[PDB]
Each structure stands twice: as structure tokens, then as C-alpha cells.
């Protein structure tokens, strides 16, 4: 299925995924395509934080869903 990932800069990344895929796996697809390291990536779905070890299915992320990619802050 297709999902979309909206970046901070306003780009929409388009991914081919399955409900069973982990969030970590989705981050890996983002990385190959946009060069964003997974350790920086934080995926959000309608305001909810998504966690690496959980799956798209766990969050009821279905076809044509849009996630938001935000970035970890690096505060001293």
C-alpha cells in the first residue's frame, strides 16, 4: 500500500509499505530515499508519536495515510 510522509520543509515522501512493517523499517525506507538518518527521524501520525518497534498496523495506519516526519531536538 502507499503511504505519505510530510517533512518539516514541506516535501511529501511517497512509500510502498505493508501494515506489518515496523516503524523502524519505515524509517529505513525514508533514509535510503531522502538520506535522513533513522536516529534523527521521529514519525508522528495525527499528533501521536510512533515508536520504532511497533508496526503500522498497531497504529491503524491504512492506505493513503499521511505521517509527519519531525526531528529529534539536540538541546544542550
Amino acid at each position: 500500500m502507499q503511504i505519505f510522509v510530510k517533512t518539516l520543509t514541506g516535501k511529501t515522501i511517497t512509500l510502498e509499505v505493508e501494515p506489518s512493517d515496523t516503524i523502524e523499517n519505515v524509517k529505513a525506507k525514508i533514509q535510503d530515499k531522502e538520506g535522513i538518518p533513522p536516529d534523527q527521524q521521529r514519525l508522528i501520525f495525527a499528533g501521536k508519536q510512533l515508536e520504532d518497534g511497533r508496526t503500522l498496523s498497531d497504529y491503524n495506519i491504512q492506505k493513503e495515510s499521511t505521517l509527519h516526519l519531525v526531528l529529534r531536538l539536540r538541546g544542550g
Binding site: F4, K6, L8, Q40, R42, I44, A46, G47, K48, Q49, N60, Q62, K63, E64, S65, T66, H68, V70, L71, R72, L73, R74, G75, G76
Partner: protein
């Protein structure tokens, strides 16, 4: 064989009597061993150690049980990481600023000071005895242990750059949020209405807007049909909410929020300060205080008090 008597512990409550050989290192006897945070594994017992309490790694069934009950983790690396952090955090200063325990800046700790400052303003209780005990001490101004625990629970080291929202999320996994509940509706002009219910940590966190009012009145979100829909809060039961967004210019006004933090910098490196609403606004930067009637800057998390909220919005006809 010459010996001294010492006590070992993983929880500082259950003490285990030991006789240690002066000719052997602590590492030869207990494995990793710490005295008030300091790693003494490589050294031999000293006459001055007589009767003192040492922290050790959980290396038998009893110690593992005691560590699990105290820390609420099964991570074998936990105590070691906790002690490693504590050796540094015991050197930090914890001034009272605007009536709150803060942290004087050191070791990239501004994100930790903002976590600590915010927690003290929330009606929140921890489940893990290690956190209960250390948090109580932190409220009292003795925050070294609590700070080292934040680092250990977050899997971060002293000096590592950090994210207040992420750190809060880790900590709140150990908080009693069993009755925290959030109901959200999403309404699309074409697709109609969908409702979900969140509990625990997910019920009190949000990433996308700083404004609690906005969550109440409607946030524009993409719909799977390709149009925009409106997400809004139907019901909230919790003692607070934390509303977060990527840092952006925002105005904090008196009488409208509990406390907040701002992040100055970029995605490579930034610095946090805390804003608390008292008789006026107080901006707290470690040991420093600046009073102000309003704050405009790159706010990234805002906290609001709550008890029970129910929407006035009705289903579409």
C-alpha cells in the same frame, strides 16, 4: 587474610553484609562496585571503607529481584549506567529559582533542567520506587540522583544532547497515568466522522500544535481521501496535558498556560529555557531568572493544567 566489613546494595534499602579481602580488588569480589557514584571496581578495599555502603551490579537472584522491584526494569545495564551518570550529576548545583529546583548549566543539561522544572508543576506520581524516592529528594533540592535516573531511563549519558519531549515521554512510562484518557474525533466533509480513545502516556502528549485551545477547536489534518479533515478533542481526563510542536515563534501570555519551554538553535544543537506562569512570567535558564509580562520566542512544549474536559462541539447534521 585481612578483611574489612562493608555493605552492598542495589536499592539503598536492602543492605547485604560482606567481608572483603584487602588483597583483592572490588572487581574480583563483587564485580562493578561504586561508592557514592564513584567507580571503585579497580581498587582494593581501604581501611576507611569499613562499614560503608557500596552499590553493585545485580549479580545474583536476590539482587536481581531487588533491582527489578526498585527500578522497574529488567535491563542488566541499568545500574551501571545510573552510577556512571551519578558520578557527574552529584557535582551539579541545584539552586532554587522561582521556588523550583533548577539545575545550574553544565554538561549539556539544559534539557534536563526544563524536564525537572516542568515536572514540579504537574500533579504526577511515579510508580518505580527509585523514581518516587529520588523525585521527592529532587523536589527538596537534592536532585543528583533523580537526574542520573532520568539519564538511565532515557538511555542517555551525561553530556549527550537531548530532547525534552522525548525525555518526558520516557519518564512518563513510569508515572501513574492509568486513568489518563483522551477521546479524539476526526471529521471530513466527505468521509464523515471517526473517533479514537487514547490512554496512558499517549493521552497526555501531542506533537503538532502548542495550543490546547487549537486541539479543542480543530486541527487541520490530511484525510486518506486526499482532502483535509478536522481533528478535535472530545474528552480529556488527566491532571495535565503537554502540547508540543517543532520550534517556532510563539507568544506565551499570562493566564493561559501552566509552563513551557523554548528551544533556541537548530537541529544540530540548541539550548532550552523554561517559562513558568507565576505572579508574572518567569524565564528560568538554569540558575538564572528573568521576569517578564509575556514571552515571544521558539516555544516547543507547553503544559496546561487539566481535570476533566468535555467538548461542546456537536456531530454534523
Amino acid at each position: 587474610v585481612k578483611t574489612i566489613k562493608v555493605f552492598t546494595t542495589v536499592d539503598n534499602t536492602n543492605l547485604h553484609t560482606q567481608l572483603v579481602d584487602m588483597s583483592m580488588t572490588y572487581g574480583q569480589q563483587f564485580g562493578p562496585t561504586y561508592l557514592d557514584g564513584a567507580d571503585v571496581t579497580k581498587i582494593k578495599p581501604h581501611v576507611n571503607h569499613e562499614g560503608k555502603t557500596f552499590f553493585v551490579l545485580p549479580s545474583d537472584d536476590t539482587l536481581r529481584s531487588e533491582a527489578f522491584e526498585y527500578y522497574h526494569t529488567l535491563d542488566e545495564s541499568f545500574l551501571g549506567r545510573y552510577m556512571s551518570a551519578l558520578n557527574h550529576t552529584k557535582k551539579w548545583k541545584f539552586p532554587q529559582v522561582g521556588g523550583l529546583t533548577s539545575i545550574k548549566w553544565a554538561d549539556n543539561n539544559s534539557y534536563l533542567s526544563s524536564v525537572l522544572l516542568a515536572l514540579q508543576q504537574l500533579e504526577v506520581k511515579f510508580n518505580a520506587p527509585a523514581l518516587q524516592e529520588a523525585y521527592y529528594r529532587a523536589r527538596a533540592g537534592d536532585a543528583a540522583n533523580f537526574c542520573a535516573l532520568i539519564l538511565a531511563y532515557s538511555n542517555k549519558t551525561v553530556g549527550e544532547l537531548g530532547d525534552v519531549r522525548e525525555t518526558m515521554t520516557h519518564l512518563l512510562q513510569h508515572a501513574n497515568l492509568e486513568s489518563a484518557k483522551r477521546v479524539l474525533n476526526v471529521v471530513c466533509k466527505h468521509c464523515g466522522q471517526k473517533t479514537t480513545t487514547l490512554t496512558g502516556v499517549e493521552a497526555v502528549m501531542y506533537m503538532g500544535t502548542l495550543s490546547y485551545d487549537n486541539l479543542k477547536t480543530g486541527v487541520s489534518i490530511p484525510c486518506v481521501c486526499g482532502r483535509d479533515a478536522t481533528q478535535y478533542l472530545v474528552q480529556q481526563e488527566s491532571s495535565f496535558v503537554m502540547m508540543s510542536a517543532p520550534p517556532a515563534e510563539y507568544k506565551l501570555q499570562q493566564g493561559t498556560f501552566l509552563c513551557a519551554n523554548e528551544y533556541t538553535g537548530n537541529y544540530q544543537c540548541g539550548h532550552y529555557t523554561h517559562i513558568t506562569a507565576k505572579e508574572t512570567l518567569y524565564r528560568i535558564d538554569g540558575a538564572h531568572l528573568t521576569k517578564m509580562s509575556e514571552y515571544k520566542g521558539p516555544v516547543t512544549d507547553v503544559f496546561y493544567k487539566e481535570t476533566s474536559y468535555t467538548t461542546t462541539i456537536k456531530p454534523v447534521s
